[PDB]
Design a protein around this ligand. Structure first.
Ligand code: NUY
Ligand code: NUY
Length: 168
């Protein structure tokens, strides 16, 4: 059973205009089997549009590629991002709801630290009473953590089924 193709794709921005399907593939095949690899080009001039995409055989291979950033492809540092879940909302912060009053910082840290490096955990409290409001924000050092988090169907933290969204 293969993972949905959308979850196996990486949009690669910032390409050198000299990058080709072949050189993009030769680069990204270091981290997994590529089922597709395309440089976007103008339909008339064939000049590169400066971005492209690669599709790996598995999600674990996407993770491997993202963990190997920064990627310097044909002399230029590129910007890989997972496919949208059609514009990417590139953020480093999530809202975590449904955590009730008994969820503490270590619950959120022990879970979310496996998605990425955490910089801030903010457990929301009531401005008047100080009581926990049942939601939190987690800020990571990089957007890929958030991208991995929000495409999961479920998040279980401190026994609670949590609702997690990108936060601006
Ligand atoms: C066959 C399947 C159950 N394998 C279990 C391990 N595995 C992962 O842990 C993944 C990590 C990131 C996304 S997939 C997918 C491969
Ligand atoms: C066709 C082209 C102009 N689109 C603009 C760039 N784009 C994104 O913002 C991304 C999607 C997923 C990760 S990046 C999608 C492609």
């Amino acid at each position: 059973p293969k993972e949905p193709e959308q979850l196996r794709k990486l949009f690669i921005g910032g390409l050198s205009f000299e990058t080709t399907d072949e050189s993009l593939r030769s680069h990204f095949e270091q981290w997994g089997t590529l089922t597709d690899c395309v440089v976007m080009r103008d339909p008339n001039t064939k000049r590169s549009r400066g971005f492209g995409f690669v599709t790996y055989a598995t999600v674990e291979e996407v993770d491997a590629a993202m963990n190997a950033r920064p990627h310097k492809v044909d002399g230029r540092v590129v910007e890989p991002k997972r496919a949208v879940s059609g514009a990417h909302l590139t953020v480093k912060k999530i809202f975590v709801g449904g955590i009730k009053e008994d969820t503490e910082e270590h619950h959120l840290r022990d879970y979310f630290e496996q998605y990425g490096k955490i910089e801030v955990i903010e457990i929301m409290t009531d401005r008047g009473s100080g009581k926990k409001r049942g939601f939190a924000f987690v800020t990571f050092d990089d957007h890929d953590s958030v991208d991995k988090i929000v495409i999961q169907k479920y998040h279980t933290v401190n026994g609670h089924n949590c609702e997690v969204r990108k936060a601006l």
